[PDB]
Amino acid sequence: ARQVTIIGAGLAGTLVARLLARNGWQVNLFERRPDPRIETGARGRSINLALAERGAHALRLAGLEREVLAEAVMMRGRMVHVPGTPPNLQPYGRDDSEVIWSINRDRLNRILLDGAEAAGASIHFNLGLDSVDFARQRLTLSNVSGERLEKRFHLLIGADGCNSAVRQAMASVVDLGEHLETQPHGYKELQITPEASAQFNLEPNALHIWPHGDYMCIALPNLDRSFTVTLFLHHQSPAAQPASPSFAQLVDGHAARRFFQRQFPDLSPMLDSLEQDFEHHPTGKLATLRLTTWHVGGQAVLLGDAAHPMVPFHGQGMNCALEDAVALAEHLQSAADNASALAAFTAQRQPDALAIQAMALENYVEMSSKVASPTYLLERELGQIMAQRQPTRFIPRYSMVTFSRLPYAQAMARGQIQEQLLKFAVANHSDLTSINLDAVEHEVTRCLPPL
Ligand SMILES: Cc1cc2nc3c(=O)[nH]c(=O)nc-3n(C[C@H](O)[C@H](O)[C@H](O)COP(=O)(O)OP(=O)(O)OC[C@H]3O[C@@H](n4cnc5c(N)ncnc54)[C@H](O)[C@@H]3O)c2cc1C
Ligand SMILES: O=C(Cc1nn[nH]n1)c1ccc(-c2ccccc2)cc1
Ligand SMILES: [Cl-]
């Protein structure tokens, strides 16, 4: 039986543990945090994640989809809150079977942890990876008190998140070619209670967006009708725009309150604990980290956030991580040897990871900026018309990323063709009546092969 050691009992690490263990691998999984299934008196605070078809299919392959969806809120569309107009529901995809699921991250982790153990994996909590000796095939783990433990390993899977200790160890023996692209936006997570969401008739079965240009809020529903709200806002005000909102100008909750009353007037009444949450929850940081290589020979490999930290603006980090896990398990299971498996996995997934990294960054202006420009609405109106005329050729990029399993690289490649096509077609035209619909449809057939 082939052996594997996995660092990080997160989403990708527990899914790949289950997939390999049920295939007969001997799987040991080490996690720095305690087991969240051991109930304590602490008040856990979990965010929700948007689970899309990519992630759902990965869970489906693992035999865990029904259990996860049993605990997920169905989001049938986007509820767009734009000042001046009532909230507008934009249904997802083209049919009523295309939805996104709001799943509590802790609920999901417990389902995955149970699933990995049922398949035969052994999970060891309260043990953080400190170092790896690749030449001697040994690694060093320690608890929170620093007591150290050495283990031999045969195959090392770094599924240990955006601050991967496995990545750090690999960069000591191989040039990973790291390029860190810092993001000027931070985020703050806020909360709407079930009482508040009911009192203001906030729709539970939808994903809510408050676009506002350089900043925005979004909210995802929980089973108990609470919502977790995320504010995206610049860390610092630029010198060019010294009065522009930023976290540095919100020194306390009272400043935050006045800011929300002015810029999010229909949302502020629902944020009962805005002041307390703002000061007691830390401001998160966002970054994109691109690596040229994800593996060291056949000894170690990265996946998930360990391999490709990305901005959350597309709701695809978890979905990509689960897709990564399926691909890595497939390659390891059928390859001639671990070295071939890790090279083939990297060669398959690295261009797709770059794609979703770039599309997630681009999708920020799509949510907050590109909703009030006249050209955008005519392009989307023309994009929907082309999606009906050529449904196997023109699929909007959001639907390809979210509701299909087409490789991220093809989704971005086809999306660029589609975006330029719509851009040229609507240029110097103000109405759909002044646009020739068969000329755009002919370009769809010339430049977009059917799927
Ligand atoms: C604010 C925010 C919102 C997001 N929203 C979405 C969304 O709506 N949809 C979506 O698809 N994605 C979303 N994402 C992205 C998603 O959360 C991550 O991409 C996903 O969790 C990656 O899974 P992973 O298993 O690679 O890493 P993680 O889930 O972070 O797991 C890493 C694990 O490794 C452990 N670990 C770390 N270091 C060590 C060590 N040295 N030794 C041992 N164990 C270690 C950690 O404790 C953790 O258990 C969001 C991210 C953020 C920050
Ligand atoms: O589903 C999406 C993509 C989308 N783009 N336009 N409308 N939504 C989506 C985008 C972002 C998130 C998210 C990010 C950080 C924190 C909390 C949630 C969730 C989900
Ligand atoms: Cl993400």
From Swiss-Prot:
GO terms for biological process: anthranilate metabolic process; kynurenine metabolic process; L-tryptophan catabolic process; NAD biosynthetic process; NAD metabolic process; quinolinate biosynthetic process. Keywords: FAD, Flavoprotein, Monooxygenase, NADP, Oxidoreductase, Pyridine nucleotide biosynthesis. It catalyses: L-kynurenine + NADPH + O2 + H(+) = 3-hydroxy-L-kynurenine + NADP(+) + H2O. FAD binds at residues 11-12, 31-33, 50, 105, 129, 305, 318-319. Its cofactor is FAD. GO terms for molecular function: FAD binding; kynurenine 3-monooxygenase activity; NAD(P)H oxidase H2O2-forming activity. Pathway: Cofactor biosynthesis; NAD(+) biosynthesis; quinolinate from L-kynurenine: step 1/3; Siderophore biosynthesis; quinolobactin biosynthesis. The keyword Secreted does not apply. Its EC number is 1.14.13.9. L-kynurenine binds at residues 78, 92, 363, 398. It comes from the Bacteria. Changing residue 367 to A: Abolishes kynurenine 3-monooxygenase activity. The keyword Flavoprotein applies. SUPFAM superfamilies: FAD/NAD(P)-binding domain. Changing residue 398 to A: Abolishes kynurenine 3-monooxygenase activity. Optimum pH is 8.5. It is an enzyme of class 1 (oxidoreductase). InterPro entries: FAD-bd (IPR002938), FAD/NAD-bd_sf (IPR036188), Kynurenine_monooxygenase (IPR027545). Catalyzes the hydroxylation of L-kynurenine (L-Kyn) to form 3-hydroxy-L-kynurenine (L-3OHKyn). Probably required for the synthesis of quinolinic acid and the siderophore quinolobactin. Belongs to the aromatic-ring hydroxylase family. KMO subfamily. This is Kynurenine 3-monooxygenase. It comes from Pseudomonas fluorescens.
